[PDB]
DNA sequence: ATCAATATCCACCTGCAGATTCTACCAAAAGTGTATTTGGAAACTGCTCCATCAAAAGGCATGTTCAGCGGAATTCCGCTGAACATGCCTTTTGATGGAGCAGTTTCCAAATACACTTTTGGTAGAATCTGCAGGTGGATATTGAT
DNA sequence: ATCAATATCCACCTGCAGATTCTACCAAAAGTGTATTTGGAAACTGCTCCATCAAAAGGCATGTTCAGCGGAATTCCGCTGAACATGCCTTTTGATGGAGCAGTTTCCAAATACACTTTTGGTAGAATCTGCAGGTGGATATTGAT
């Protein structure tokens, strides 16, 4: 059988996301979760649907900013994975509370 | 009779009337909500300047000098996110290490 | 009627977080990036829903638009483009 | 115009504990934050009451201004005395 | 007089100026990149300094105008005038 | 002449300066610095003392911010010196320009 | 059922810069959001520095200053070149 | 060095929904006489503050050595993440109701703008403690060598 | 387990500039008091765009399974804190001095609020024609135990 290295999912999945800019996170569970975090401050809110699209690509943009900086902060320290000190230094340098 | 005292509390309202007029956009602004700009400025300046009493045992010094107010504005984590990128003239840093 | 609905807060999961995570670029993941990407999407999304729906309610309005959340994203300083 | 706030700063520091003193140079720091967060709440109040295209600026938009920029704890007790003092103007006729 | 000399060779002040925060043992070669980063920051603040001065139409500089520029670049060194 | 171990004397000089709040760079050095960077890209103009004092105040505050979080980025890599790759990773996490 | 829109002038200037291409609706919305927020920040600092100069009316020198201080140097030299060129053209308001 | 096994690249065929001129239309408008009233342009100048500028002196920066100690090359050796069948669950879309939003019309109430009169909140200054910076000084921790 | 010149802290005295608290003082917004007009707020009511039901496929999960590799670890030199010594570049203190600027006045381009009307610019249908998604076919490079 044909088989090639665990860990060499890298470059083919690199192009496999990179050609397409469709929204990564699956939609209506994400609707459920934003509905649930919103639902416990004030009543009877709805969403407009393109507002869900807006907050969806907002979390997409902020997450890709997050682990792009943890990616190069991981390679800052001769390291091949990301781990918890990497994301914690990202959340040091974030500047936003 | 007097507008700060017909209001009652201890900020002037008559200048922030036209200081809002100085800055406004909407071609119309109300003549009765000077009553909240003075409340805003009362609350935020007291909510920094009363904390300056925490100088006492760490300074025993009677005026509120320029490093010293930031030297206690830091540990107000509820405060530092209101002067976020803002920084002093000659204030110092709250010290720490590794 | 009461709309009692609990956790979807883990609801996007290890393939979902790894597909967003490699979409950002990183190609080697460690076995506990569950909970921190959990907690940080908690933080960021409660910030945006707080400011957005609070001044949506300022608009006398109990029903959110999209222009309110994009004005909140520019209010936060992360101005999204192109939904109006 | 020559116009400051430092006298009202001094009256405030007296209606604290009156034991301390306004220092020589921090009152410029106090002036600079009172006018800059004054101006930025004025900016956001301007365009937030401009998005509903209502002509004046008034009570509802100002309490939503002074909640929608300043963070949680001082915001909510800030708006508590905001409502307090604005009733206290209307406390008399 | 007006002749160009090199004040980019500022002073080695960073071996006390990095002694403002918790810089441990230093190990050097930072002098040239601390030189580069502070020259970038000073040129960033000085071009909008002179920008308001030509909008000031008088050939001095001043402090209220420098704090106008200083917050409009975002890096608002607060509180001096 | 008895002077013991180096390195914790670095710590007492650490606390020595950050107790104090003296304006830490030298005056006529920044004077000639800011003239001879300003006079070139735009022509001969004049300064005022309080304005130039405030602008090196800006310079101090910005660069002390960048080297403290440079220190945090350096101690990410389990290491106590300061080296260049820490600095440029700090500049890059800080919003490149 | 009544809305000010930006897209019309946008597509005519797109077809005149480059001749032969097509557009798309969400891309129409991203560049009209771009044009109104770049107007938004030039306008805000235009009012701000026509306030702090202690001068009373908005002026072309003031907004040439404004466009210099907001956008970086490459499009600074561009935008000032056609700022002066546009004011040369509309200033030249003759019978012919 | 080497073929299948992907993997990707083109690439042609076809659907299929959608941008895009096209009409229109219409309704609110951008260009227009215009009187006029004011703030921008621009001369005059007191005058201050800003650039040079030297001399005593003095911290302090710059070159020196130097010597441990920590960056780093290398090992290795347990171990914890990546592929992968291989089931399966929750989706992914498609089709039904209704609270509740534009948008209306209409009323009244607060804010504009006018004269008013003063008083309070801006300076000048001044003087006087006076706090406090800066010294001294007397006592008290301190960590490498032994 | 023990020593001790340096460093810091706690206390005293002084001088010095400076806050501050006046009192004047003055002068110029500001509270009062008119009336006008029009926006804020509420009633209402059609008409979306929200809300909830139910049917079938793809990504999800998950244990299995296996190896790059993480952290530790040992060592090995080079490079930097550190201490010292000295030039040197400040450093301040007057001192000059002079030339742009803030204020000043004037005076006129011109902005604005009028009425006012031919156009364009927005919308909305529509239709259409075509550009791209997707399908699928099929050459073609890369490669992994051999």
SSE blueprint and pairings:
This is part of a larger assembly, with 2 copies of chain A (97 residues), 1 copy of chain B (98 residues), 2 copies of chain C and 2 copies of chain D.
Chain A: H1 10-18, H2 27-39, H3 49-75, H4 84-93
Chain C: H1 14-24, H2 33-58, H3 67-76
Chain D: H1 6-14, H2 26-48, H3 59-68, H4 72-90
Chain F binds a DNA duplex (146 and 146 nucleotides) through residues 1-10, 12, 26-29, 46-49, 79-81, 83.
Largest interface: B-D, 55 and 57 residues
Large-scale geometry of chain D: globular
Strand content of chain D: under 5%
What's the N-to-C terminus distance of chain C?
A: 33 Å
CATH architecture of chain D: Orthogonal Bundle
**Approximately how much helix is present in the residues of chain C?**
55-70%
The tally of beta strands of chain D, per DSSP, is 0
Number of helices of chain C: 3
Strand content of chain C: under 5%
List the quaternary state of the chains. Answer: part of a larger assembly
Q: What sort of overall outline of chain C do the alpha carbons produce when their principal axes are compared?
A: extended
Helix-strand sequence of chain D: HHHH
Number of helices of chain D: 4
CATH class of chain D: Mainly Alpha
Main sheet of chain C, how many strands, which sense, barrel?
Answer: none
Rg value of chain D: 16 Å
Q: The CATH topology of chain D, please?
A: Histone, subunit A
PDB class: gene regulation
Keywords: Nua4, nucleosome, gene regulation
Entry title: Structure of piccolo NuA4 and H2A.Z nucleosome 2:1 complex
Chains A, F: Histone H3
Describe this structure in words.
The structure is cut from a larger assembly and holds two copies of chain A (97 residues), one copy of chain B (98 residues), two copies of chain C and two copies of chain D. Chain A is an all-alpha fold and 97 residues long. Chain A has a single domain, classed as Histone, subunit A (Orthogonal Bundle), CATH 1.10.20. The termini of chain A are far apart. Chain B is built from six helices and no strands. By secondary structure, chain D is an all-alpha fold. Chain D has one domain: Histone, subunit A, CATH 1.10.20.10. Chain D is built from four helices and no strands. The radius of gyration of chain D is 16 Å and the shape is globular. Chain F binds a DNA duplex (146 and 146 nucleotides) through α1 and α2. The PDB classes it as gene regulation.
């Amino acid at each position: 059988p044909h088989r090639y290295k665990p860990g060499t999912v890298a470059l083919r999945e690199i192009r496999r996301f990179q050609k397409s800019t469709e929204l990564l996170i699956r939609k209506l569970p994400f609707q459920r979760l934003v509905r649930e975090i919103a639902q416990d401050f004030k009543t009877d809110l709805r969403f407009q649907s393109s507002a869900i699209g807006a907050l969806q690509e907002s979390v997409e943009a902020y997450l890709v900013s997050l682990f792009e900086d943890t990616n190069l902060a991981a390679i800052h320290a001769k390291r091949v994975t990301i781990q918890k000190k990497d994301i914690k230094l990202a959340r040091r340098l974030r500047g936003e509370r | 009779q007097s507008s700060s005292a017909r209001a009652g509390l201890q900020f002037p309202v008559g200048r922030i009337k036209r200081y809002l007029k100085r800055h406004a956009t909407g071609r119309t602004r109300v003549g009765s909500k000077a009553a909240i700009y003075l409340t805003a400025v009362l609350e935020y300046l007291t909510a920094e300047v009363l904390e300056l009493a925490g100088n006492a045992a760490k300074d025993l010094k009677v005026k509120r000098i320029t490093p010293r107010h930031l030297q206690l504005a830091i540990r107000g984590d509820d405060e530092l996110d209101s002067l976020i990128r803002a920084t002093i003239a000659s204030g110092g840093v709250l010290p720490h290490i590794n | 009627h009461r709309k009692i609905l609990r956790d979807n807060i883990q609801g996007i999961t290890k393939p979902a977080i790894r597909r967003l995570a490699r979409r950002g670029g990183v190609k080697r993941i460690s076995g506990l990036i569950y909970e921190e990407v959990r907690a940080v999407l908690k933080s960021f999304l409660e910030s945006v829903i707080r400011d957005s729906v609070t001044y949506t309610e300022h608009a006398k309005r109990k029903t959110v638009t999209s222009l309110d959340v994009v004005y909140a994203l520019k209010r936060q300083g992360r101005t999204l483009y192109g939904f109006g | 115009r020559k116009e400051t706030y430092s006298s009202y700063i001094y009256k405030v520091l007296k209606q604290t504990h009156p034991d301390t003193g306004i220092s020589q140079k921090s009152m410029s720091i106090l002036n600079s934050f009172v006018n800059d967060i004054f101006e930025r709440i004025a900016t956001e109040a301007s365009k937030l009451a401009a998005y509903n295209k209502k002509s004046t600026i008034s009570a509802r938009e100002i309490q939503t201004a002074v909640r929608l920029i300043l963070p949680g704890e001082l915001a909510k007790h800030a708006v508590s005395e905001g409502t307090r003092a604005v009733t206290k103007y209307s406390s008399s006729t």
